[PDB]
């Protein structure tokens, strides 16, 4: 996994690769690692996949209820506080490593959360097995006051470093852009530089190839 | 030892043109000892199909639990559960036992009865959803299955062709796994009808 | 005024009274007389025991709480058993944890606090017993009177139960004499036995009637009944 | 500290009445009128903002509430009871449904849960029933648009159109006369405005009337783009200005 | 919960009195099916007939109930009955025998009668069901937690009147179709309204499954009721 | 004496008498209070009556600092007042801990109204005989006034008043906003918004105030604070040089 | 190790269970009946951890007998085994799991068929023509794969069983002291008292 | 207890006040650097042991409490104050400020006016001491109401006590030393005993003073007590 | 981690480096280790980041509630709340905290709460893995009643050495100045402090 977060002048961008693995094996070649906590607060996770999704949905649910209750737009500091307190309680057993980014009435925010419940703030971050490849790109090209365009480019380039150099990362790049004035834009498969080449042969079998013992129609109704 | 390797077992699901297929072997073992030649691992709640591999006690338990939960759903909702919804129900049910999990690899197949779109999904033992549109594999021969499927698969296959592909994937993966095989069942699922076929295979 | 206000311990009367507590006080006045008094070196309990029948045992009024402490009872006897068990525990706790003999004053405070909770809880009744507690601690001999209202007072002498007003007036008059009775247990018991006589319409207090207890400087709390009281009748 | 009324405060009387439920229903009667009308392509729920003081800012007190992106509620009766029922309805939509099936409950099932919450205030120890009647309107994929009334006893009924509170009898009459199964949403909103003018004493404008619809999806209210299968809430509160526009051609 | 000097349970009796003001529900059992029919409580033009189920509920695939009393109390009990049927299915891998489900529900009602100081449920049930032990069955339960089995029964308003009518016309050798006629005639004779129209009825059957050897619960759509009301000559 | 007058169950008329009686308790202190919104502030004024000459005047107060940003003025007996204050302080601290931002005035008010609703529905709790007025300069909403009662009702106000002579002050203010046509006081300094508040109380009640007759709380961006007698004195001088 | 065999012929289910109880270096008993009757047409045999074995069996027996009296009816073999599997499935995740494997043989009167269920301590259930728990299956499954026919009589099944016990006596390292054989059919449960020299 | 009357009163609390008014009289006087507490102890009988039925209670080391009404209720309240003071000291390390302590007792007394299953306390409590920023004196009614005081009195002789207290506040506006305040407390207690002159009484004084006791609560005994009695005896005639 | 607090004539100063590591990897080079728990009460954290943040958040909650009810807490009160949390939970915590505060009465104060949950009042304190290398230096160069600039120099020099030798320390030197003034944030970059 490679996930990054990059702040620009009017907002924040997150990006992630699209490969999930079971040990050395690739299960999903194009899964979404970008997750919505609320409309303008988005989230990328590394670690125990079920944990990062569950912790996102739980806190997402509570953030909605809070928002409805208070009649306000959800803040990023609320997502962060609820996440860290929840993860802390579980003393690292919920293996959620998250980059949380978004915009709210108080501005734009970028945070990392570690599974034991510690948090950090920053202008650029990476997590996952590919975080070192991505950080080397970020440390090379990040500058203060980036345009939206520049920030998308940089985040995308960080994910590629992860994709090309880290065996834990691969396939495509997803981006989400959160700008202070606007609706958030989720950009599925922003890059697709890993198209499988056409196979040399077709493997469709002549019908009747498989030996069948018996057969029956299955009742679905009642 | 490893709870997911005691009993054996493989399940594979595939999508085609306006159809899905789901298949499993029939073996139930106890380590080296083969016990049952008739252990089916695929179940169906209305038009939603669920395969489960792993510890056989948990296979049985989860089948009974999902029969329970979908029966109630139908009574309250006054309609059969859809593939998408059921996928979510399996996920949260598994995650509910996060620190004492069922030792299973579930697989969901079916056609949404409103949109007509074919649907498959996979999970890990704690309910992390594998959302993939082509194939899903699970069990003690998952490596062999991934190999077969990535090689054999092409999209938009006619039900009669998809049948061959899924069967050939299952048979050959099973034959390279000591704990899988002993018979196999394949379901071709078309909106309107479902056909079930028992394959002829090596009995070693 | 007495109308809808004596239903529980959790209701004040328009006069600021707690009738359940006042009714509990009435079970004391119904009880058989007991006297307590002390000098600087000893403290004595004298009690008139009461039979149900001429075929029955007279029921005990005196309970030992520790080697240096004990009490007499007037009112509901089973309530005295509850409270003396608590007092026995408090004495015990103090010995075990602090290796310290419980001050008779602290025993008073503990009983007051326990009674109090029952004058404020719904569905619970107040205690219906009066107690006289005697002891010899690190500051000499002591006597206490306990009322189920939770009021505990330290006294040179007192009496509770039916017709006790007689004994009280006697002790009030005898004060300057008995406070000095030091190093003579038998004389103090005699002054106690005489005090309880002013509370007799009954009869002449027999070997079975009479219950005496003593504690002091070099005497553990000890109870005398039967033939052992004869020499005081 | 600790309850002395661990018994039911609602009990049956010799005649079979459940006293406290009747008395709560009388509290609904004294309440400001609210109403609901179901169209072919939407539902409208409407009510009056009877303000307590002209020094009060009536926009800070909504009588019309979103429960899910596709379900809204209105009430007649005791406001504060409504407010807490809304919180619990919002919560129960998540805890009993969304956290299980990853989607929002269909209207009938959510109404069912609210009804349950109200039923329990009718049987449990040491409580009085809720003093409100709710109208709940929503949409869901497999049932389409719907409208439900929920009463203090926990009873619920589906309606094509109804009214609760003060002048509900006259308003139901007015609705039976005007309703048909071919109504577009705009026709329903129009009827809702006409019906509500009979009830309203004072000013009748976009600042004293409160109106919401369950219509089509508002992708501009979603808050994000990029996911085609997500199209936005069907619940929409009409603005003061939007109301005044429909009162000119009234 | 307390007894009267007469040896009666006040709150239970008052709950029963409440039920006699609820719309009549009728259950009739025949050799090849069961009928459930119930009169909807004084409704209005604007009520949604199509998405309304106030008196008839499915408990599982083989068992249904007709309700008389408070609907919200009944939904409480129906929900636990549904759970109970599923627990049994999970435990034994067999559908629950009707009596077992009925006894359970009845025991829950009985509890409120005997401890806890909560009011009883103001509900009477007619249960209609099939199982492989007793075939077609009809039971009734009321707030006291008592239950009895019947060939034909009513609950709610006018039970006395409806019971006499059923006693007269019922015969052991009936087919379901004759039982359909009997239930509607009886509701027609006993209504406190002018006519017994479709919009004021709920109707259901449990039959031998059109053509199969299996069992099917048909909950009648409003249009179906309108037809079956003409057939029997009440229009 | 029917049960419907002793606990919070419905009367045959759908009323809750114990709630109604709790409203009557709110006036038992015979103190009046009013709140107004400035351009970037919110001001609460309450009468301060110290009849007994044995009392320490500094400890007699019906204004509370709930948090750095929220103040609360109470109309009702002090014991119930302090109960509500303690709860609001705890609720405010807890909100900040759990959600990572300061509890808004309106949200605290909604929460206290919710608690009051409960006492309205459960038999073992009596309602608190108080009316709570919450003020702040909300970071999202600007100057704010929210007021909760024993019914669990709450709303936001342009300005508001509470106490036995509530109506006098209310119509005085209603008449002002009729004239100005805006929903706050134009004025940049909190000191002049405080003077407006004192001035209009004087007209409405038809009474003069010394520095010891008054109690003042001011909410600005991020503080809420009360005024000492001397700050109030300075305010009384300024009004006198014109009015 | 504890021999537990079952075989389902056409009209009966035959259970055979070893008679030895061995602790350490001593055979304490050579006549142990590793069985409880659950209902007139259902028999259960068991093997595993020393105490658990009988405690589980008796607990199950109590529960089925309770059902029978409450309902005045006998549960089908399928239902009894489902209930048994559930109990074991709950046990495996509890504080101390019942370490017991069982065979269930029943005659279903409603279907007129014999039925054999094999359930291990985890709650793994399967319906089988023949089954075994422990090491014994490592010999008998293959033997019966060869010799077993679906249309056999009770006498043919007893011969098939004799063959299984002979093999175990020949190849198993432990002296299990012969078996107690029980037949379950329409006329109930009976013990074949002659097997140690039949 | 939880019952509001039709005019918003609580009759139960009003009745609890009658129990207080029935009680012995007790007072508190705030001096320039501390606080003085004094109480009337009725001598029911000669048999009561002198100096040995102590009414004034310490809480922590720097707070005294005196009360009138149901004595056991006052003890119940003081036990709670001690638990409450220990818990503050445990977490915050510093001994509890007097206003902080006042509210603790306040909230606790108020709780007993919320529930039908409890009665209000039948005492008024006068209490206080020295903290980080000076002396404080408080009086607490059965309703949970409390304020700061310059001087406080409760119980049977409250009216005359308040009148003598008011005079001191008038003749000494310039802050009344700890040593004067003790003398005056003895006087005031003597002057409220006029009502209950049928039975004899014993005087108890305690004080907490910055310069006189180092901010700790101490009992006035020995020569200091006798001197205060003599002053009161002289000024009564 | 290198963290310290120093009392001086006008108050107290806290300093820290900005490096956080997991193994030899710098997870954050610009961390803010100086944590405010009240307006003029700050702390430096060492040990488990999860633990010390969770603790600092709870203390901040307690001090906010304290301020609502009772007024400004003393620095001692802050330190006591930290201890309570650290002592009572010694068996699931790896937390070393230094508490620094200013009030008008007590002036500038420093408390250190090492691993066990003990409390120590000190004229100055140093902690974190980097501190071991500067015990000699600090003891030799610290004086009481130093000026602001002198104290700033002492911390700058001390932490630059701690940074020089400790691999787990580095980045920028942050400081917080606590006086009557005022809260003042200071920062010093490598190009300045390495040349010392
Ligand atoms: Mg595998
Ligand atoms: Mg194989
Ligand atoms: Mg209440
Ligand atoms: Mg109450
Ligand atoms: Mg007084
Ligand atoms: Mg370094």
Short mmCIF file of N, CA, C and O in Angstrom, two decimals, chain B residues 60 64, chain E residues 90-94, chain G residues 38 42-44 56 60 64 75-89 102-106 115-119 123-127:
data_model
loop_
_atom_site.label_atom_id
_atom_site.label_comp_id
_atom_site.label_asym_id
_atom_site.label_seq_id
_atom_site.Cartn_x
_atom_site.Cartn_y
_atom_site.Cartn_z
N UNK B 60 -20.82 -24.71 8.61
CA UNK B 60 -22.17 -25.08 9.04
C UNK B 60 -22.82 -23.95 9.84
O UNK B 60 -23.94 -23.54 9.53
N UNK B 64 -26.26 -21.63 8.90
CA UNK B 64 -27.42 -21.54 9.77
C UNK B 64 -27.67 -20.11 10.23
O UNK B 64 -28.82 -19.68 10.30
N UNK E 90 -32.71 -22.97 13.68
CA UNK E 90 -31.26 -23.07 13.85
C UNK E 90 -30.83 -24.25 14.74
O UNK E 90 -29.82 -24.89 14.48
N UNK E 91 -31.62 -24.53 15.78
CA UNK E 91 -31.30 -25.60 16.72
C UNK E 91 -31.55 -27.00 16.14
O UNK E 91 -30.71 -27.89 16.27
N UNK E 92 -32.71 -27.18 15.53
CA UNK E 92 -33.17 -28.52 15.18
C UNK E 92 -33.14 -28.79 13.68
O UNK E 92 -33.33 -29.93 13.26
N UNK E 93 -32.87 -27.76 12.89
CA UNK E 93 -32.98 -27.83 11.43
C UNK E 93 -34.36 -28.28 10.92
O UNK E 93 -34.49 -28.87 9.86
N UNK E 94 -35.38 -27.96 11.72
CA UNK E 94 -36.78 -28.20 11.37
C UNK E 94 -37.60 -26.96 11.68
O UNK E 94 -37.25 -26.19 12.58
N UNK G 38 -30.86 -41.88 23.83
CA UNK G 38 -31.43 -40.54 23.90
C UNK G 38 -32.95 -40.55 23.80
O UNK G 38 -33.62 -39.76 24.45
N UNK G 42 -33.20 -43.48 19.06
CA UNK G 42 -31.93 -42.77 18.87
C UNK G 42 -30.90 -43.20 19.91
O UNK G 42 -31.16 -43.14 21.12
N UNK G 43 -29.73 -43.60 19.42
CA UNK G 43 -28.63 -44.01 20.27
C UNK G 43 -27.39 -43.16 19.98
O UNK G 43 -27.13 -42.80 18.82
N UNK G 44 -26.65 -42.82 21.03
CA UNK G 44 -25.43 -42.04 20.89
C UNK G 44 -24.23 -42.70 21.57
O UNK G 44 -24.28 -43.08 22.74
N UNK G 56 -21.16 -35.02 29.03
CA UNK G 56 -21.80 -34.51 27.82
C UNK G 56 -22.96 -35.40 27.41
O UNK G 56 -24.06 -34.92 27.15
N UNK G 60 -26.88 -34.30 27.26
CA UNK G 60 -27.68 -34.45 26.03
C UNK G 60 -28.92 -35.34 26.28
O UNK G 60 -30.03 -34.96 25.92
N UNK G 64 -32.95 -34.36 25.65
CA UNK G 64 -33.84 -35.03 24.70
C UNK G 64 -35.05 -35.64 25.43
O UNK G 64 -36.19 -35.52 24.97
N UNK G 75 -38.34 -36.62 18.76
CA UNK G 75 -37.63 -35.86 17.73
C UNK G 75 -37.02 -36.81 16.71
O UNK G 75 -36.61 -37.92 17.05
N UNK G 76 -36.98 -36.37 15.46
CA UNK G 76 -36.33 -37.14 14.41
C UNK G 76 -34.83 -37.17 14.67
O UNK G 76 -34.30 -36.26 15.35
N UNK G 77 -34.13 -38.21 14.17
CA UNK G 77 -32.68 -38.30 14.31
C UNK G 77 -31.94 -37.06 13.80
O UNK G 77 -30.95 -36.63 14.40
N UNK G 78 -32.45 -36.48 12.71
CA UNK G 78 -31.85 -35.30 12.13
C UNK G 78 -31.89 -34.15 13.13
O UNK G 78 -30.92 -33.39 13.25
N UNK G 79 -33.01 -34.02 13.83
CA UNK G 79 -33.20 -32.95 14.79
C UNK G 79 -32.30 -33.12 16.01
O UNK G 79 -31.77 -32.13 16.53
N UNK G 80 -32.14 -34.36 16.47
CA UNK G 80 -31.33 -34.64 17.65
C UNK G 80 -29.87 -34.30 17.35
O UNK G 80 -29.19 -33.65 18.17
N UNK G 81 -29.41 -34.71 16.17
CA UNK G 81 -28.03 -34.45 15.77
C UNK G 81 -27.77 -32.97 15.55
O UNK G 81 -26.69 -32.48 15.90
N UNK G 82 -28.75 -32.23 15.04
CA UNK G 82 -28.61 -30.79 14.90
C UNK G 82 -28.43 -30.12 16.25
O UNK G 82 -27.60 -29.23 16.41
N UNK G 83 -29.22 -30.57 17.22
CA UNK G 83 -29.13 -30.09 18.59
C UNK G 83 -27.79 -30.47 19.22
O UNK G 83 -27.21 -29.69 19.97
N UNK G 84 -27.30 -31.67 18.92
CA UNK G 84 -26.02 -32.12 19.45
C UNK G 84 -24.88 -31.29 18.86
O UNK G 84 -23.99 -30.85 19.58
N UNK G 85 -24.94 -31.06 17.55
CA UNK G 85 -23.93 -30.26 16.87
C UNK G 85 -23.86 -28.85 17.43
O UNK G 85 -22.77 -28.32 17.65
N UNK G 86 -25.02 -28.25 17.68
CA UNK G 86 -25.09 -26.90 18.23
C UNK G 86 -24.37 -26.84 19.58
O UNK G 86 -23.54 -25.97 19.80
N UNK G 87 -24.70 -27.77 20.47
CA UNK G 87 -24.07 -27.82 21.78
C UNK G 87 -22.56 -27.90 21.68
O UNK G 87 -21.83 -27.19 22.38
N UNK G 88 -22.07 -28.76 20.78
CA UNK G 88 -20.64 -28.88 20.59
C UNK G 88 -20.04 -27.61 19.97
O UNK G 88 -18.98 -27.16 20.40
N UNK G 89 -20.74 -27.02 19.00
CA UNK G 89 -20.26 -25.80 18.38
C UNK G 89 -20.13 -24.62 19.37
O UNK G 89 -19.21 -23.81 19.25
N UNK G 102 -18.75 -37.87 18.92
CA UNK G 102 -19.90 -38.75 19.06
C UNK G 102 -20.33 -39.35 17.74
O UNK G 102 -20.07 -38.78 16.66
N UNK G 103 -20.99 -40.49 17.83
CA UNK G 103 -21.78 -40.99 16.72
C UNK G 103 -23.23 -41.03 17.16
O UNK G 103 -23.53 -41.35 18.31
N UNK G 104 -24.12 -40.67 16.23
CA UNK G 104 -25.55 -40.74 16.47
C UNK G 104 -26.19 -41.65 15.45
O UNK G 104 -26.10 -41.41 14.24
N UNK G 105 -26.82 -42.71 15.95
CA UNK G 105 -27.58 -43.62 15.10
C UNK G 105 -29.05 -43.60 15.48
O UNK G 105 -29.41 -43.82 16.63
N UNK G 106 -29.90 -43.31 14.50
CA UNK G 106 -31.33 -43.28 14.75
C UNK G 106 -32.15 -43.97 13.68
O UNK G 106 -31.74 -44.05 12.52
N UNK G 115 -30.43 -43.76 10.04
CA UNK G 115 -29.61 -42.57 9.85
C UNK G 115 -28.42 -42.54 10.79
O UNK G 115 -28.56 -42.75 11.99
N UNK G 116 -27.24 -42.28 10.22
CA UNK G 116 -26.00 -42.24 10.97
C UNK G 116 -25.30 -40.88 10.82
O UNK G 116 -24.96 -40.45 9.72
N UNK G 117 -25.10 -40.22 11.96
CA UNK G 117 -24.40 -38.95 11.99
C UNK G 117 -23.08 -39.06 12.75
O UNK G 117 -23.02 -39.66 13.82
N UNK G 118 -22.03 -38.49 12.17
CA UNK G 118 -20.74 -38.39 12.82
C UNK G 118 -20.48 -36.93 13.16
O UNK G 118 -20.51 -36.07 12.28
N UNK G 119 -20.23 -36.67 14.44
CA UNK G 119 -19.93 -35.32 14.92
C UNK G 119 -18.66 -35.32 15.79
O UNK G 119 -18.59 -36.05 16.77
N UNK G 123 -17.93 -29.72 16.50
CA UNK G 123 -19.27 -29.54 15.97
C UNK G 123 -19.31 -29.70 14.46
O UNK G 123 -20.11 -29.07 13.77
N UNK G 124 -18.43 -30.55 13.95
CA UNK G 124 -18.42 -30.88 12.54
C UNK G 124 -19.37 -32.05 12.38
O UNK G 124 -19.12 -33.12 12.91
N UNK G 125 -20.48 -31.83 11.67
CA UNK G 125 -21.48 -32.88 11.46
C UNK G 125 -21.52 -33.35 10.02
O UNK G 125 -21.46 -32.54 9.09
N UNK G 126 -21.66 -34.66 9.84
CA UNK G 126 -21.89 -35.21 8.52
C UNK G 126 -22.74 -36.49 8.61
O UNK G 126 -22.60 -37.27 9.56
N UNK G 127 -23.66 -36.68 7.66
CA UNK G 127 -24.46 -37.92 7.60
C UNK G 127 -23.73 -38.89 6.67
O UNK G 127 -23.39 -38.53 5.55
#
